[PDB]
C-alpha cells in the first residue's frame, strides 16, 4: 500500500521534545524490512525497505535540532542508515566504524545535530554498496533553515521553514528519481519519480496557479551515471544540495544530477493558462520507461 | 544541400510586424520533411527534418517578441515542435495537450511570447520520445536580451542583440552537438558538431583574433547521457542556458551537458599566435568518431 | 615503484631561474616510457607513462612563471603532452600543429607562460585519443595564484601559494580519479584515486583536525562519461577548475566531473570526533572496484 | 564517376620535361579527398580516395625517370603516400620521418628516381595502418624497364615500354584486387578486381585472339591474409613484382599474393575458340562476393 | 566403400583407342551421384561425388591425347566438371558457356586435347562455387609429358610417363588435401589427405628405401585460405603445377598452396634408417584434426 | 631477462671437440622450462621455453658437423625438439618414434650430422601440436655451407660461414616472427619479431651502409596461416629455406611464409640517405599489434 500521491506532500517530522539545553529533539523509528513493492500495476519488485515503503519516509527537521533515529533491522541481510549530513564518524552508517552494519535482530540509535540546512538524503551503505541502494533502502532528509540564524535571508528561510505562514503559501513536493532492474543484470528496466512508473501521468499533480512551487529533488538511481529533470513551458531556480538561500542556477529548465546529488527547484505558474505541464527526465528512454509526469495547473 | 560552414552564422529572424499594442511580432514557417542527409561523405542517414536540414533552422528573436511558428507536417509520421521556452500548455508541442501531435498533411501555429532571454532549442516530442529526436527533429532557438529591460547589464545585453554595433564586433556561432545511430540499435556510430563528422577539421573555422568569440552550444545527442566541449589552449566563460548576463562559470576549458542542456561560451584569442586551435568532446571516443574541429586564428 | 601515499603531497616545482626580464623560469624533464604498473597487489597493467609512474608527476608552478617542459619519447609509440592551460597553438601537443606527435627517440621542449591560475592537467593527445590517455599518460598541473595580482583575495591567494606560512597551515592533497580496462574491451575493471585500488582503505589518509584540507581533484577516467566525489559526514566548498578565488559551489558533499574536468575541494574536520571518514565515487560500482578511501581524523 | 572498364587501360604518365642534366622528369598531382564510391549499384562506401577514385590513378613511368608527386590533403584525416619503390627515408610516406603525415590543408612533394623496373603500388601509411588502406587509399605504380639498360633482354624490355610498337601489340590491363567491409567490423562483405563487384561479368573484357595479354595484378585487399587469380582454360607466366624480365613461374593457372604483393601475368588466347573465359579468385567465397570476371575472346 | 590406401596408387587411364589421324584417344565415364562418405569411423558426411568417391577418380593421360569425359548427372542438383587444363570455352564446365550446368538426368561429353603436361585437377563449378566443391566434387587430373616432345629433358619426361621402365622405379602417390564442415557453418571440422582423417597414421605408407618418391599433391580444401605439406627429417624438390621438368624449388621441407594450386614433390629416403617419417600440414590444427600421416621406410 | 637487441646477433655455436675420425662435434645443452616471459612491458605470458627464453637459443653449425643436443625436460608437460633438418626417424622428436616424448624429469640426446646447409628451425612436436609451439618452444637452427663442398659458389659460401673475413663484412641478423594468444582462445593478441612487440621501434637496428645485410627470417606464428616481411624503400633477394646459394626471388620487397617456412633475405642500403627505414608485416593488423620495426641507416 504505497501511495505516490500522498508521498509528494508527506513530511515525517518525528516525535518532538525539548532537551534541557533548549535544543529541540526529533526522534524517528525506522525498521529495515524485506517487502514486496509495486512499480507499475502488476510489476512486483522484491525490495529491501525502510518502514515498508520505497522511497523511505521523508524526514524533515530544522537546522540545529537534535536528531535520533532508532533503527531496527527486521530484514534478512545486514543494513545501515548513512545520512548525507554532518555527524560523527561513529554515526556514519558505514561497515567499518561505530557499530558497523546492523545485523538482523539488532538495533542501533543514530544521533547527531541537524546540519547543514538543505536538501539531503539517507541510504544504506552495506556490502556491496550498489546492491542495498538498488533494492530500495533510500529516502529523503530535509533540514529546514532556522531563520534566526540567517538574518540576511530571513524571508527566504521562513518560506522553507515548515508551518510558517510564508511556508504555507508554497506548494512543496518531494521527488526521488529512482529506477528498478527487475531481472538483476545491473541495467534498469523501469524508471520513475517516487517509484511508480508514470504515476503522475495517470493522475497529474494539482497546482494552484497563484502559489509558487518548490520541489525537493533527489537522485537515487543506480547503475546509470546521471538523471535529470526538464520542466516544460517554464523555468526554475535551482539550489544545489539546497544548502544556500540564493540560487545556484537562475532561470533554467533542465538540470542533471549524479546519484547522491539533489537540490531544490523553485518556480511559479502564476499567470499561465490552466492545463497540463509536463516534467520528465531529458534522458529520453528514462521518460519513456516511467520517469514522466504532469502538473495540472488550475485557475 | 546542407552546409555546416554557412550554418555556423545563419540566423532566421522571421517576417517582422507589430501587434496593435506595439509588441513586435515575428513569424516563421517550418515544414517537417522526411529526407536523406549526409553525415560524412558517402554516409547517408534517413532523417526526419525541419525545413530539409539537420539541425533545423536557427530561430533568433528578441526578449518580449510575439513569436508565431506556422508548422506543417509533410512527412510520414506525426510530429510536433516542443520549444524550450515559456509558453502556454496548449502550445507545448506534446501529444497530450492543445492540438496534440500534428499528423501528415496537417498544420498548426505555435504562438507565444519570447521569454526568457537566453540560449534555447526546439525539438519534436512524439511517441516514442527518443526516436523523433534521433531522426533529426531538433534546432536552436535564441532569445536575445532586450537591453531596455536590463539597465544594470546594458553593455552585456547590447553585445548579444543581433545587429547592434557592439554585437557586430563579436564573432557568433551556433553549435549543436548531435550523433547518429546508423544501424538503429540505440548506440551512436557518428558524432559531430552540426551534423557532418569532422567538418571543421576538413575546413577550420576562421577566427579574427582581434574580435571576441561567442558560441551558442546545444546538446541534442541522443542515447548517451552527456556530451562536452573542450577548448584547446584557452579558457572561456560559460553561461548556463544563456539565461543570465553574468557568467555561471568563469575561466573554464571543459564543460558538459546532458541532452536538452545548452549555454553560451565566450572567449578571445586576442594576442595568440596565429594557428589551429582544436575544440572537441572530452569523451574521447566522441571526438574520434567526428566531434572534433579546429579554429583557425588569423593575424 | 609507485607510492600512492607519497604521491598525495608530492609537488614537482622544477629547476628555478630568472629570465632577463625578471620573469621566473621553471624547467622540467619528462620522459615517456612503457612500463609495468601495479593497480592492485598482483594486478599488473601494461602502461604508457610519464617518468615511469601513473599518474605522471604533479607539476606545480606560480601564475605568470615561464614554464619549459623538456619532453623525450623513450617509448615505442608516438606521444605528446597536451596541457590544459593557455599556450600557443604550436605548443598544444596535438598531432596536427607545431612539431606534431613526438616519435620514439625524439625530443621537444614545450614552452609557455603559466596562465590561468587554477587546478589543471596534462595528458597525451595522439591517435586514437582514448588509447593514450587510458594507457596512463596523464598528470596534474597546478598553477598557484600570484597574490600580488589579486589584492581583493590576497589571503585566499596566499593560502594557495606553495611555501607561504598560510599555505603550510593547509593540508593539501592531489587526487587523480582514474580507471583501468585490463582486457582492453573499452570498459574499466578497476577504478581508483591515484591508481592503486582501495589504497586509502588499506592505509587511511591522516588528517589533523585543527587544520583545513584542500584537495586538487582531477578526473582522468576514460570510457565512462562521469566520475564523482562524495565526502562522508562533512561538506566542502568546490572551486570548478580552481580558476576563481571564490567557491563555485558552497557547502556540498557530492560533485561530479566528466573526463578532463577538475577542481579544488576545501573542507575542515575541526571539532569532529576522531575516526575514519570515508570518501568515494557515488557511482556505486566504481567504489566497489577500488575508488574508495578513508580519511583518518586525529586529535 | 568511376569507370572500371576505362580504368583497365588508363595510364597516368605525368607532365613530362627534361632536367638540366638531361634526366626525364615526370610530375603528378594527387589530392586526398573523402568521397562516396559505388562498389555495386546501390552499395555506397564512405571512402578516402586519391583524386576521387578507388583505386587511385595508375602511375606509369620509365626506369630512371625523376618522379615528382605533389600531394595535397583535402580530407579530414592525416594521410601519406607510401610508394613501394626505391627512395630516400624522408620520402617514404610513413609517420614520424620526413614531413610525417600530411594533415588536412597541407601539401608535400614526394621526389625520387624511379627504380627498380617492375610492377609496384602506392598506398597510405597512417595510423592505424589497416584503416587508411581499407578506406580506399591505394593504387598502381608501374616502372617500365629502360630497354637501353637491358641489352640481353631488349625485346622483352621494349614490349613493356609504353608506346613502342612492340608494346602496342600487347593488350595490357591493370587489375587491383580489393575488398570492402561495409559494416566496419574488420571482415569484408564485397570483393572485386577494380572495386566494382562482378563488373567484368556484367561487361566482359574484350580480348583480341591474336595479340598477347599482359596483366599488372596487385593485391590491395585488407583483413584477409591472401588473395589469388585463377585463369580458366589457359595458362600464364608469372613475374613476381615484375622485377625480372624472365618469368618467376612458367605455365601456371593459379597464383596467390598476400597484401602488398603484385606481379605481371602474361598469356595468349591465340588459337582458342572465341567465347567467354572466366578469371577469379580461387578463394571461392571471394569470387561469389564479387571477385569474378570474364574475358571475351573474339576472332 | 572408399579405400584411401588403394587410392594412393590408382590411376584411371581410360578406354584407349586411336583416332583416324593417329592421335591417341582416352575415354572416361563420370557420374555425379549423391552419396554418404565416411571421413572417420562413425563420421558420415552427405557428399556430392564423382563415381561414388571423394576425391573423384584420378585421371591420368599423356600430353597430346584426345580426352573424352562422358559426364552424366545422377544427383539432385546441377553440376559441371571444370578441368584445370587447356580447352575451348564451351568445354570449361562453368554455368555461363557451352552446355552450362548439367541438370539431373542430363549428359554431356567434355572433349579436349590434354595440354599442358603437369599436375592438375578437376572440380564442379556451379552455384554457389564453394558449396559444390566442399560437398566432394573434385579430383586429380595428371597429364604425363610426352618424352618425344622434350628431347632436352628426356630422362625426366620418361620417369613421369606412366608405365615406362624408368617410371616403374619411382614410387608415385596422389594426395588431395581436403576438409569437411560437418555442421555447415563454413568452417572445417575435419582435415585429411585423401578424405579419411589420420588414415596414414592408422596404416603408414610403405616406402622402399632404394627407390625415389614422387607425390602429386593437390589442395582442394575449402573455406581456409591455404594448406601445406611438411616432410619430416628430409627435403624434397617442388615442381609448381608440375608444368616444368626442372624444379621450381630445390631442397625444401615445407611448401604451401592455396586452393586450386598443386604440384609435384620428389624426394628419396635412400640411406635413411628404417622407421616412421611423418608428413602433415604445418597449420598445426589441421594436423591435429586429421591431416597427418606416416611414411614407413623399410630396408 | 630476455634481450631482443642482443638476440639479433647472438649465435650459439656449441662446445666444440674433435671426434677420433677428425669430424667436428658441436654439443648443446637445452632445458625445457616453464617460465614467465615479457612480450611488452607489463604483459606477462606463461611460456614453455627452451633455456628460459622465447625464441629458444639460435643454434648455428657448419654443414657436416656432428651435432649433439642434450635435451632435459624440467617442465610440467612432455616435450620434444623436432629439428627441420635431415636426421634418422628415431631422432625426429615426434611422439610415436624413437624415445617418444621427453616427460618431466627425463633427458634425451638428439644426435645427427648437420645437413642440409640453409636456414632452419626447431620446435616442440607434442600433443597437441599447436599448444606447445604457441607456448614458446621454437628456435632458429642455422647450418652454414662448408665452402670446400661448394667450389662453384665458393665466394657465396664463405660469406655465410660464421667468422670468416668475408662473413665479417656482412651484417647478419636472426628474426623469428612470432605471436601470442594471451587469453588462450586460439587467436593472437600480440605479434612481433623476436617476441617483444615494437622492440625495434623503441630502439632501431643500426645498419652501416658500406656493408650488406643478411636476415635469417623464420615464421613461428601459430593460429594465423601466413606472416610476411615488407622492406620499406628498398628491395632484397630471397633464398627460400636458405638451401641454395643463388636466390629464389630477385628484387622483391614483400615476401610471405606459412608457419615453419623460413629463408634468407639479402639487401644493401649502400648509397641511401641516412634515416629510419621501416620493416613490418604486410598483414596490417600484425604490424599494428607489434610486428613493426625500424632500421637506422647511418652515414
Ligand atoms: Ca532548559
Ligand atoms: Ca535489467
Ligand atoms: Ca498601436
Ligand atoms: Ca548503432
Ligand atoms: Ca574491460
Ligand atoms: Ca620526425
Ligand atoms: Ca564486415
Ligand atoms: Ca563447421
Ligand atoms: Ca586471444
Ligand atoms: Cu542494506
Ligand atoms: Cu550517498
Ligand atoms: Cu516527430
Ligand atoms: Cu527538450
Ligand atoms: Cu601517447
Ligand atoms: Cu584534456
Ligand atoms: Cu590515410
Ligand atoms: Cu605496402
Ligand atoms: Cu555441383
Ligand atoms: Cu579450380
Ligand atoms: Cu612441448
Ligand atoms: Cu615445423
From TrEMBL, chains A, B, C, D, E, F:
<feature type="binding site" description="type 1 copper site">
    <location>
        <position position="282"/>
    </location>
    <ligand>
        <name>Cu cation</name>
    </ligand>
</feature>
<feature type="binding site">
    <location>
        <position position="187"/>
    </location>
    <ligand>
        <name>Mg(2+)</name>
    </ligand>
</feature>
<feature type="binding site">
    <location>
        <position position="124"/>
    </location>
    <ligand>
        <name>Cu(2+) 1</name>
    </ligand>
</feature>
<feature type="binding site">
    <location>
        <position position="189"/>
    </location>
    <ligand>
        <name>Ca(2+) 4</name>
    </ligand>
</feature>
<feature type="binding site">
    <location>
        <position position="189"/>
    </location>
    <ligand>
        <name>Mg(2+)</name>
    </ligand>
</feature>
<feature type="domain" description="Plastocyanin-like">
    <location>
        <begin position="40"/>
        <end position="146"/>
    </location>
</feature>
<feature type="binding site">
    <location>
        <position position="20"/>
    </location>
    <ligand>
        <name>Ca(2+) 1</name>
    </ligand>
</feature>
<keyword id="KW-0186">Copper</keyword>
<feature type="binding site">
    <location>
        <position position="181"/>
    </location>
    <ligand>
        <name>Ca(2+) 4</name>
    </ligand>
</feature>
<feature type="binding site">
    <location>
        <position position="123"/>
    </location>
    <ligand>
        <name>Cu(2+) 2</name>
    </ligand>
</feature>
<keyword id="KW-0106">Calcium</keyword>
<feature type="binding site">
    <location>
        <position position="185"/>
    </location>
    <ligand>
        <name>Ca(2+) 4</name>
    </ligand>
</feature>
<keyword id="KW-0479">Metal-binding</keyword>
<comment type="similarity">
    <text>Belongs to the multicopper oxidase family.</text>
</comment>
<feature type="binding site" description="type 1 copper site">
    <location>
        <position position="84"/>
    </location>
    <ligand>
        <name>Cu cation</name>
    </ligand>
</feature>
<feature type="binding site" description="type 1 copper site">
    <location>
        <position position="132"/>
    </location>
    <ligand>
        <name>Cu cation</name>
    </ligand>
</feature>
<feature type="binding site">
    <location>
        <position position="183"/>
    </location>
    <ligand>
        <name>Ca(2+) 4</name>
    </ligand>
</feature>
<feature type="binding site" description="type 1 copper site">
    <location>
        <position position="79"/>
    </location>
    <ligand>
        <name>Cu cation</name>
    </ligand>
</feature>
<feature type="binding site">
    <location>
        <position position="132"/>
    </location>
    <ligand>
        <name>Cu(2+) 1</name>
    </ligand>
</feature>
<feature type="binding site">
    <location>
        <position position="84"/>
    </location>
    <ligand>
        <name>Cu(2+) 2</name>
    </ligand>
</feature>
<feature type="binding site">
    <location>
        <position position="101"/>
    </location>
    <ligand>
        <name>Ca(2+) 3</name>
    </ligand>
</feature>
<keyword id="KW-0560">Oxidoreductase</keyword>
<feature type="binding site">
    <location>
        <position position="181"/>
    </location>
    <ligand>
        <name>Mg(2+)</name>
    </ligand>
</feature>
<feature type="binding site">
    <location>
        <position position="187"/>
    </location>
    <ligand>
        <name>Ca(2+) 4</name>
    </ligand>
</feature>
<feature type="binding site">
    <location>
        <position position="282"/>
    </location>
    <ligand>
        <name>Cu(2+) 2</name>
    </ligand>
</feature>
<keyword id="KW-0732">Signal</keyword>
<feature type="binding site" description="type 1 copper site">
    <location>
        <position position="123"/>
    </location>
    <ligand>
        <name>Cu cation</name>
    </ligand>
</feature>
<feature type="binding site">
    <location>
        <position position="99"/>
    </location>
    <ligand>
        <name>Ca(2+) 3</name>
    </ligand>
</feature>
<feature type="binding site">
    <location>
        <position position="106"/>
    </location>
    <ligand>
        <name>Ca(2+) 2</name>
    </ligand>
</feature>
<keyword id="KW-0677">Repeat</keyword>
<feature type="binding site">
    <location>
        <position position="79"/>
    </location>
    <ligand>
        <name>Cu(2+) 1</name>
    </ligand>
</feature>
<feature type="binding site" description="type 1 copper site">
    <location>
        <position position="124"/>
    </location>
    <ligand>
        <name>Cu cation</name>
    </ligand>
</feature>
<feature type="binding site">
    <location>
        <position position="185"/>
    </location>
    <ligand>
        <name>Mg(2+)</name>
    </ligand>
</feature>
<dbReference type="GO" id="GO:0050421">
    <property type="term" value="F:nitrite reductase (NO-forming) activity"/>
</dbReference>
<feature type="domain" description="Plastocyanin-like">
    <location>
        <begin position="188"/>
        <end position="297"/>
    </location>
</feature>
<feature type="binding site">
    <location>
        <position position="183"/>
    </location>
    <ligand>
        <name>Mg(2+)</name>
    </ligand>
</feature>
<dbReference type="GO" id="GO:0005507">
    <property type="term" value="F:copper ion binding"/>
</dbReference>
<protein>
    <recommendedName>
        <fullName>Copper-containing nitrite reductase</fullName>
        <ecNumber>1.7.2.1</ecNumber>
    </recommendedName>
</protein>
<comment type="subunit">
    <text>Homotrimer.</text>
</comment>
<feature type="binding site">
    <location>
        <position position="96"/>
    </location>
    <ligand>
        <name>Ca(2+) 2</name>
    </ligand>
</feature>
